[PDB]
DNA sequence: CACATGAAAAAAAAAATGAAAATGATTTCTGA
DNA sequence: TCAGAAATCATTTTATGCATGCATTTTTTTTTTCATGTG
């Protein structure tokens, strides 16, 4: 039999013909610098091949999915299994989905109800009758979805004073169909008996109601039967995602009036299945059980007393649900509720849910690849996560974990360290062993950090906090928060930590950040349930930095986004050759017709279509991917063309441009963040989320913040090596020293150990928390016995 | 670790709470009668569950997947693995697909040709450069397809002597758009210079060419691109296949003029890629290699000479390709080319190709379930199959094979026998052991056959061959055949045998079948390549029986197809209650408005739609699925209703209707074929190929043959137990006794030893075949030592 | 040799079916 | 005097919608004949 996984000729991305041998059915941990190719090897070439060699064998669909899937550049790979990837980018927005269905616990719940449900109104019951995704179970009106769509009145009609013929409403003034919309509302004017030019404000209330409801009958070759009607047929006739989001933006959601939002047929509620007993006490229904927390659900299902004969059938189902819920608890999601919609889950929660359902499914002989699983997970639960991972490995499953947590190491049977360098000089394997020679290795950065040879030190002096200038939020009651008031210091670095589910995301993202956005930047976000936010006068604008791409088009790259490519172009025009040939600074851009080529249109890669194949990309025969015409390229600034300057890495860019302080400051900041490897020409869509947030904060560090703005950060250590964490801390401290305020949500022990202010939320996640357990400097927060974060901080300071 | 597979609560179809325990990483063989539940237990509830469990974790889809797969009715399944099914329905139809691409051998062959592709007389070479599925390799002309579609101007026009005014060309008469067609072709006649009313033959040849090729004139102000161009754009603009193969049916495929079939660019093809060697002499390019047989290509690859530097890099590539081709040979596809299109492959060939690809991939932990694999495989290769099969068992996988071949058993680690009967009274488990208890099991039919307790008995007397009246094909030289002449005796059962790929199917299904059909039934099929067929006048018609379903609509039924339902309805109308109520026979049809439920329109179920969900069917609420209104159902002929009669099984109905010989004959024939389990009202599309085959046989048994018809059958033993084979043999004997001739292409030695004439084809398949090695009684061929069939016949006759 | 039943087709009948949004480039005036 | 925020104009990409349909095509259903026994 085969007990070793052997790869040879992995030439993909920055890897240089990397070959490796791994022990099958063992815990393997990948380590390396961000962008060193660790994720390229673990996900893009190993997982892709393991998945492709399986799905290509599937007879159904007559064709492999994802446009012939993809083919990693491997020479010879053997010892694989079917490959399953668990990463945050697997989240989805399917309305019918819930954590009950995703982890399949809902199906066993339905089986238990079918075999063990009593009507109890003062036998014809099947599991399909409890499924809200089945005609036998759904709410008749809500179609099994516990929501209903109601159009936002003020959003669709922001200006009621303009004439109706203008049609300033978005559906009436968008695209070539705006004139057609004018056609049908002009026809409806005579069809219903109202003026086609009267503004909404000047229109009678009944006229606007009749516009809302619409009319009938064929009027003039076309039909119009209401605003709700044509919008509904519009998302039933979608072609563009932009129209999707534009029209769903004002699509308000209300609980189903008949099913009370429980997305179930009213008869199939406790009216049919009140047979459940005990728990906290009394009976329960399927909707009520789904609405419980996971811990509460498991506790209730443990103590139910449904009767002996009924138990003879229900015992195995109860044991199965018990094991699934035990898995979910072990992963650390006791605050979640089985009825929670899939759309309301963060990336870390989605990853943890996926891992829990995988360990519950019982699949054996499967190769798992996992992104950083501890993201969004507090340290106090990390150990319990590891015991889960090994448990999965105990089912005969090979594990590959791309994790930089120290505790996950010293536990993996095998460690592979890549990245004797960051980018072009980091695509080599530097270690492959049982963690022992890692601490002995010399050129292994991860080994240096783990051994204690190199470490992030606690700064001696913490920035002083001034109580006079603080940003205080009072009356925060959204979700789990218990009506508390919290004071964020201004001008310093403050971090808010706590167990998952405590309420840091609610307290920061959809309460404080929304208020700051719509009161400083003039946004329109819903500010959640809060009473007051005081201290805003000290600031001028808020910026929140996330993983969203800096640009959705190939026309955007870090050079343009940072606002440095414009200076490069002006320098190129300033070159004597460009001056004598009369070249404007704009021409040197790949977005204006002056400098591009007529085939690429500046894109570089043209499209090619086949009869039965998805489109493929191939460089233009003129530019050879240079995105510029020959006349543009023949201009030399310091002996180099525009293309070479464009495609060079950030490091050699900083080595370049030395006499020009302007661009050099930006390039130096980018290097300081840790983006030296990225080429200036790298398309924005290709950049990862971590690199996106890093370049965002880099560009923000430079433009004279003058100590007035505030910055909001989600977990910024996601997918970051220790050295990357050190760089990001340096940049954050540099930003704070300008006088601004930086608030970050993070579980990393180092970042919160080097912060100025610390806010610890909640004794536990979910209903057990939502308060503030300790706040102050890291030193005195480590002295609070009630804080788990303080407990972990005690031994690090 | 887990080393067992456990299933509790299997309930698909006739399976009743099946509990199963199997050893993992072993060879497990499922046995039972046809339709006894083996297919449900293997494919519908084990493979389906495993594949669904794997793909549900995949993030490629938006959880829609391949139409949500299905949810098998199983209480619990433990120890599963990602399941891959090697089934007959894996017929890939993609024109890009070829046997090279299916088995990935083409990939490594491209890799080798890149690593060692010396430019010959006339380094800038990449693996993708050789692929016809990429623009770097496919030619501009045919886009790497090898063919281009056209049509001759004769087959598309059925009535050349008839005017083109009202649609002389076949597509012109379809739909009300015939007036449109007349309008543009009359506009074309206005300026081009032909007449609307002039028929095809009277039309000037210039007009004939110009209407097909188009003209540069504005006709109905719109330029005309041509008949062929117009139809091509019609097919490219339509996605409904069922209505469009009626137009692409009459196209003819012509090789690409520049590609000359080989679907690569000429520069990459052979101009600079002819740097191989050969055991015989000379060098060959990739097209020649892909054109070779598998054995020729393999043993040529054993003889490559390139130089030490090239060997140092190509050693592993050669090793992998050699191993893959060795697997392919061992499965038994020696005759097969490496460039054969996936469309032309038969079911067995594709199944064995998938098996070879699976063993070549080296995936570990996969749960492979395999339908009957030995179909299309001669017995002499069968042993070599098992050794290949065990190889996968020794790759760390688990094998489940539904089988009845004696040699495949006695090698399986585990054998499970299910379904003592094929009906509702059959689905169960009767044995689960290592072939030892099976031969000792008294109630197991499979064990009874294996132990020799009862078996197919050799006929005492073979029906005499009449030399005067034989159907002789002379000049049959298609494919590997060499102009041989074959004599089929008339009025006796003959079986064509031989090694796989001997040319039997091209002889019978291609040469003889097409000639017989176009000379007796009036079809227009291409008769293959031969010189003459004589002895034809002794026949009157040809009846070919295959697995194609008897109608694709739910209105179809076994009773309706066989015609028994008309007599049933007339009998129901003949009842006193129907007479006094004035009910016509049609009142008992679920296809007219008289008696069917109008809500159902007779189908007995309704379709319910919700957003984000696929189609669901639920029984009609007033019909209760009975498909008829209450008054029609009020008739109580012999105490039973029409729907009640439809629910009765064929055997139960045969017990019923006994006094009515007109229907009792049909029911008795159906029972004797072995269809006693299929209920009368079973919808036609829900019957698999076996039921269609056997029902067609039953119907043709009672067609008043008068001894002048000829039946040709492909392998009928496909998925048949020994007892089912015996029943089919009895039916075939009855059919022959009427004076008809039955020709069967069968590798199953049972029907060979029961046959009355045997024709053995080819010493070895492929280029070594095309000859006649023996013909006559089974004793006569068994006497010949050069016949592989005779060698196995020696021990049975 | 009438004849009733059982078959052979044929026609018939009907059920599908076919210009806004949204990052970059440009200019200004604005501050240090 | 010179380097930047901020507003503005381009691209470039925008979703341009309607209403049929009267013929075929494919099954079943119904009928008329039509040998072939049959007593
Ligand atoms: N979109 C939502 N829908 C329903 N409940 C939510 C939602 N967001 C948060 N909650 C609840 O509010 C509580 C606070 O959780 P949250 O603040 O998201 O945790 P964290 O701060 O670790 O992200 C949780 O117990 C959760 O159950
Ligand atoms: N479409 C085709 N293209 C090329 N060669 C073919 C094709 N069809 C058949 N052949 C050749 O003719 C032979 C036909 O053998 P076949 O009748 O399939 O034997 P069997 O029925 O036992 O498989 C094959 O060996 C193959 O080499
Ligand atoms: Zn509802
Ligand atoms: Zn170009
Ligand atoms: Zn070609
Ligand atoms: Zn009905």
| DSSP output for A454-472 | S-PPPPSSPPPP-TTSEEE
B148 membership: H or E segment, kind and range:
strand B147-150
Tell which atom from ligand 1 comes closest to the C-alpha of A376: 22
Does any CB of chain B come closer than 8 Å to the CB of residue A23? no
**Cα(B347)–Cα(B377) distance, integer angstroms:** 11
Q: What angle do CA A187, A192, A194 make, to 5 degrees?
A: 85
CB contact at 8 A, B768 and B778: no
Question: Six-digit token pair at A709?
Answer: 């703005």
- In angstroms, how far is CA A60 from the centroid of its own chain? 32
With a CB cutoff of 8 Å and minimum separation 6, the contacts of B319 are none
Q: Out of A25, A134, A365, whose CB is closest to B81?
A: A365
Can you give the distance from the CA of residue B591 to the C1' of nucleotide C20 in angstroms?
53
d(CA A651, CA A663) in angstroms, rounded, equals 13
Is A503 annotated to bind ligand?
A: yes
Q: How many CB atoms lie within 10 A of CB A580?
A: 8
Q: How far apart are CA A306 and CA A322, in angstroms?
A: 16
Q: Name the residue among B235, B215, B210, B208 with its Cα closest to residue B154.
A: B208
Spacing of B675 CA from D29 C1' in Å: 26
Question: CA A93, A94, A97 angle in degrees (round to 5)?
Answer: 115
Angle at which helices A565-574 and A661-673 cross, to 10°: 150
DSSP element (H, E) containing A691: helix A689-702
Q: Kindly give the residue spans of alpha helices, DSSP state H, lying in A292-337.
A: 294-303, 308-331
For the packed helices A379-393 and A308-331, what is the interaxial angle rounded to 10 degrees?
Answer: 120
Chain A CB within 8 Å of residue B361 CB: yes
Are A70 and A43 in contact by the 8 Å Cβ rule? The answer is no
B336's torsion region: left (phi>0), alpha (psi -120 to 50) or beta? beta
Distance D33 C1' – B155 CA (angstroms) = 36
Residue A760: beta bridge partners? A497, A774
| Cross-chain CB nearest to B358 (options A8, A57, A135) | A57
Which positions ≥6 away from B522 have C-beta within 8 Å? none
Nearest to A566 by CA among A457, A462, A666: A666
CA distance B389 to B372: 12
Q: How far is CA A670 from CA A557, A725, A734, in A?
A: 14, 14, 13
Phi-psi region of B191 (alpha: psi -120 to 50; beta: other; left: phi over 0): alpha
- Angstrom resolution of this structure: 3.2
- Give me the phi and psi of B631, to 5 degrees please: -60, -40
CB contacts of B616 in chain A (<8 Å) are 134-135
Rounded distance between C-alpha atoms, residue A215 and residue A187, angstroms: 11
- φ, ψ of residue A29 to 5 degrees: the values are -115, 125
Which residues in window 546-565 of A are less than 7 A from strand C by Cβ?
550-553, 555-557, 560-561, 565
Decide if B102 contacts B339 (C-beta within 8 A). Answer: no
How many C-beta neighbours within 10 Å does residue B138 have?
Answer: 25
Q: CB distance from A78 to chain B under 8 Å?
A: yes
Residues of A in contact with B89 (CB under 8 A): 59
Is the sign of the CA dihedral B234, B236, B239, B242 positive or negative? positive
Classify the phi-psi angles of A120: left when phi > 0, otherwise alpha if psi is within -120 to 50, otherwise beta: left
- Residue A143, chain B, CB below 8 Å: the answer is yes
CA A344, A346, A351 angle in degrees (round to 5)?
A: 120
The token pair that represents B614 in the structure block: 């696929």
Handedness of CA A542, A545, A551, A557 (dihedral sign): positive
B263 CA from centroid of ligand 5 (Å): 5
DSSP H or E run through B661 = helix B661-673
Measured between alpha carbons, how far is A170 from A155 in angstroms, rounded to an integer? 10
**A1, A50, A57: best to mutate for the B interface, most B CBs within 10 A:** A57
Residues of B in contact with A85 (CB under 8 A): 59
> Quick one: how far is CA A200 from the chain centroid?
40
Instruction: Give the one of B55, B357, B608 whose C-beta lies nearest to A135's C-beta.
Output: B608
Ligand 1 center–CA A235 separation, angstroms? 30
Which of B456, B450, B368, B374 has the alpha carbon at shortest distance from B409? B450
- CB neighbours of A126 closer than 8 A, spacing ≥ 6? A114, A136
Q: Is the CB of B569 under 7 A from strand D?
A: yes
By C-alpha distance, which of B386, B398, B366, B355 is closest to B84? Answer: B366
Q: How far is A113 from A122, CA to CA, in rounded Å?
A: 19
Separation of alpha carbons A56 and A83, rounded Å: 13
**What tokens appear for B118 in the block?**
């010396």
Give the Å distances, CA to CA, from A32 to A18, A457, A629.
Answer: 14, 21, 40
C-alpha separations of A442 from A408, A431, A437, A453, A640 in Å: 22, 10, 10, 10, 38
CB atoms within 10 A of CB A439: 14
B133 contacts A365? CB cut-off 8 A: no
B584 with B595: CB under 8 angstroms?
A: no
Give the C-alpha distances (Å, rounded to integers) separating A115 from A112, A137, A306, A309, B222. 5, 16, 11, 11, 69
DSSP B456: P
Q: Tokens in use for B274?
A: 């002819």
Which residues are CB-contacts of B68 (< 8 A; sequence separation ≥ 6)? B614
Instruction: Give how far Cα B440 sits from Cα of A452, B32, B232, Å.
Output: 70, 16, 64
For A167, A227, A237, B347, B381, the CA distances from A233, given in Å and listed in that order, are 19, 10, 6, 45, 61
Sheet holding A710-713, edge to edge: A542-545, A710-713, A741-745, A493-498, A757-761, A772-776
Q: Could you give the angle at the alpha carbon of A422 between the alpha carbons of A420 and A423, nearest 5°?
A: 115
Q: Which residue is nearest to nucleotide D5 (CA to C1')?
A: A703
Other C-beta atoms closer than 10 Å to the C-beta of A470 total 18
SS3 (DSSP) at A84: strand
Cα A642 from Cα A421, distance rounded (Å): 27
Residue A473 phi/psi, 5° resolution? -105, 120
A701 is written with which tokens? 């560090």
Task: Give contacts of A 53-72 with B, CB under 8 A.
Answer: 53-55, 57-63, 65-66, 68-69
CA of A689 to the centre of ligand 4 (A): 29
Residues of B in contact with A87 (CB under 8 A): 59
- Burial label for A776, CB within 10 Å (0-12, 13-18, 19+), is middle
Strand, coil or helix: B690: helix
Q: Which residue has the tokens 């140092």?
A: B312
Q: Which residues pair with B5 in a beta bridge?
A: B22
- B513, B546 Cβ separation under 8 angstroms: no
Q: What is the DSSP string of A707-722?
A: TT-EEEES-TTTT--H
- Which ligand is the nearest neighbour of the Cα of B259? 5
Radius of gyration of chain A (CA): 30
SS3 A223: coil
B595 is in an annotated binding site: no
Which ranges of A334-454 does DSSP label H, i.e. alpha helix?
347-361, 379-393, 445-451
Query: How many Å apart are CA B144 and CA B259, to the nearest integer?
Result: 8
Point out the residue among B62, B111, B608 whose CB comes nearest to the CB of A94. B62
Helix (H, G, I), strand (E, B) or coil at B390: helix
On whether the CB atoms of residues A431 and A437 are closer than 8 A, the answer is yes
What span, in angstroms and rounded, lies between the C-alpha atoms of B180 and B234? 15
Residues counted in chain B = 797
Q: How many CB atoms lie within 10 A of CB A21?
A: 12
Among A704, A782, A93, A97, smallest CA distance to A497 is for A782
Nearest to B431 by CA among B443, B422, B423, B421: B443
Phi then psi for residue A147, to 5 deg, are -135, 160
CA distance A234 to chain B (A): 14
Report d(CA B238, CA B579) in Å as an integer. 51
* Cβ–Cβ under 8 Å, residues A30 and A401: yes
CA neighbor of A378 nearest in space, from A500, A502, A480 = A500
**What's the burial of B9, exposed, middle or buried (CB within 10 Å: 0-12/13-18/19+)?**
middle
DSSP letters, B304-349, are: ----HHHHHHHHHHHHHHHHHHHHHHHHT-TT-BSS-BTTT--HHH
d(CA A428, CA A17): 8
Convert B325-337 to b/e letters by CB count within 10 Å (16 or more is b): bbbbbbbbbbbbb
Which residues fall within 8 angstroms of residue B760, CB to CB, at 6 or more apart?
Answer: B497, B498, B772, B773, B774, B775, B781, B784, B787, B788, B789, B790
- Tokens 């706590």 belong to which residue? A498
Query: Which DSSP category does B459 fall into?
Result: P
Q: A392 near A361, Cβ under 8 Å?
A: no
Whether B143 sits inside 8 A of A95 (CB atoms) is no
Provide the β-strand partners of residue B370. Answer: B86, B401
Residue B58 tokens, joined: 């995949």
CA dihedral B172, B175, B179, B183 (to 10 degrees): -50
* CA–CA separation, A562 and A700 (whole Å): 9
CA distance B209 to B213: 6
User: Which DSSP state fits B470?
Assistant: E
For an interface test with A, the pick among B66, B364, B611 (most A C-beta atoms closer than 10 Å) comes out as B364
Question: Which residues is chain B interrupted after (C–N above 2.5 Å)?
Answer: 122, 220
Question: How far is it, in rounded angstroms, from Cα A185 to Cα B58?
Answer: 47
Domains of chain A: 4-91+371-451 (3.40.50.300), 99-145+260-331 (1.20.1580.10), 148-255 (1.10.8.280), 470-547+703-794 (3.40.50.300), 558-687 (1.20.1580.10)
CB A539 within 8 A of CB A708: yes
Residue B200 · residue B168 · CB < 8 Å: yes
């Amino acid at each position: 039999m085969a007990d070793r996984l052997i790869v040879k000729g992995a030439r993909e991305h920055n890897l240089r013909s990397v070959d490796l041998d791994l022990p099958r059915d063992a815990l393997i941990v990948f380590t390396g610098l961000s962008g060193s190719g660790k994720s390229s090897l673990a996900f893009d070439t190993i997982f892709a091949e393991g998945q492709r060699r399986y799905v290509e064998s599937l007879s159904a669909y007559a064709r492999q999915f994802l446009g012939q899937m993809d083919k990693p550049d491997v020479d010879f790979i053997e010892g694989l299994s079917p490959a399953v990837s668990i990463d945050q980018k697997s989240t989805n927005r399917n309305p019918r989905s819930t954590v009950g269905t995703i982890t399949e616990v809902y199906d066993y719940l339905r089986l238990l109800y079918a075999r063990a449900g009593t009507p109890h109104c003062p036998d014809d019951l099947e599991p399909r009758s409890f499924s809200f995704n089945s005609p036998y179970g759904a709410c008749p009106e809500c179609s099994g979805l516990g929501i209903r769509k109601e159009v936002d009145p003020e959003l669709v009609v922001p200006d009621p004073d303009r004439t109706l013929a203008q049609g300033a409403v978005a559906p009436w003034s968008n695209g070539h169909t705006a004139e057609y919309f004018t056609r049908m509302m002009a026809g409806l004017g005579e069809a219903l008996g109202f003026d086609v030019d009267t503004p909404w404000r000047k229109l009678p209330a009944k006229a606007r109601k009749a516009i809302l409801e619409g009319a009938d009958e064929q009027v003039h070759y076309a039909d119009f039967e209401g605003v709700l009607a044509f919008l509904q047929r519009k998302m039933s006739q979608t072609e563009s995602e932009q129209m999707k989001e534009r029209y769903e933006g004002f699509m308000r959601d209300v609980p189903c009036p008949v099913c009370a939002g429980t997305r179930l047929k009213p008869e199939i509620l406790a009216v049919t299945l009140a047979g459940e007993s005990k728990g906290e006490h009394g009976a329960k229904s399927i909707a009520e059980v789904c609405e419980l927390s996971i811990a509460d659900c498991a506790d209730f299902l443990n103590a139910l007393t449904l009767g002996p004969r009924e138990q003879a059938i229900a015992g195995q189902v109860l044991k199965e649900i018990r094991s699934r819920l035990g898995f979910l608890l072990d992963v650390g999601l006791e605050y979640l509720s089985l009825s929670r919609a899939a759309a309301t889950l963060s990336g870390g929660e989605a990853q943890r849910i996926r891992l829990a359902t995988q360990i519950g499914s019982g699949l054996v002989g499967v190769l798992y690849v996992l992104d950083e699983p501890s993201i969004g997970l507090h340290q106090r639960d990390n150990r319990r996560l590891i015991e889960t991972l090994t448990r999965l490995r105990d089912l005969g499953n090979t594990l590959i974990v791309v994790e930089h947590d120290e505790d996950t190491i010293e536990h993996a049977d095998w460690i592979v360290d890549i990245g004797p360098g960051a980018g072009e000089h980091g695509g080599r394997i530097v270690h492959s062993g049982p963690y022992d020679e890692l601490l002995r290795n010399k050129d292994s950065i991860t080994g240096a950090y783990l051994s204690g040879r190199e470490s992030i030190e606690i700064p001696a002096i913490r920035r002083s906090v001034d109580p006079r200038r603080q940003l205080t939020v009072v009356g925060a009651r959204e979700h789990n928060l218990r009506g508390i008031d919290v004071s964020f210091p201004l001008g310093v670095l403050t971090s808010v930590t706590g167990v998952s589910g405590s309420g840091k995301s609610t307290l920061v993202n959809d309460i404080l950040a929304a208020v700051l956005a719509n009161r400083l930047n003039g946004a329109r976000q819903v500010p959640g349930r809060h009473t007051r936010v005081t201290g805003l006068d000290y600031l001028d604008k808020l910026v929140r930095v996330d993983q969203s791409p800096i640009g959705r088009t190939p026309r955007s790259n870090p050079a343009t986004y940072t606002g440095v490519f414009d200076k490069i172009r002006t320098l190129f025009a300033a070159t004597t050759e460009a001056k004598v040939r009369g070249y404007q600074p704009g021409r040197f851009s790949f977005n204006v017709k002056g400098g591009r080529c007529e085939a690429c249109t500046g894109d570089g890669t043209i499209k090619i279509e086949m009869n039965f194949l998805p489109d493929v990309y191939v460089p233009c025969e003129v530019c050879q991917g240079a995105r510029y015409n020959r006349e543009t390229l023949e201009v030399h600034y310091k002996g180099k063309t525009v293309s070479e300057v464009l495609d060079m890495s950030i490091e050699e860019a900083a080595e370049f441009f030395e006499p020009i302080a302007g661009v050099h400051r930006y390039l130096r900041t980018l290097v300081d963040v840790g983006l030296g490897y990225v080429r200036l020409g790298q398309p924005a869509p290709t950049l990862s989320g971590g690199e996106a947030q890093r370049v965002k904060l880099a560009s923000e560090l430079q433009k004279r913040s003058t100590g007035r703005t505030v910055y909001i950060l989600d977990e910024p250590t996601t997918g970051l090596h220790f050295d990357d964490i050190r760089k990001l801390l340096n940049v954050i401290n540099g930003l704070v020293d300008k006088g601004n305020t930086v608030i970050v949500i993070e579980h990393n022990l180092d970042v919160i150990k080097t912060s100025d202010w610390i806010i610890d939320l909640g004794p536990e996640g979910g209903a057990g928390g939502g308060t503030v357990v300790a706040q102050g400097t890291p030193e005195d927060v480590a002295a609070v016995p009630a804080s788990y974060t303080g407990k972990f901080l005690a031994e690090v300071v």
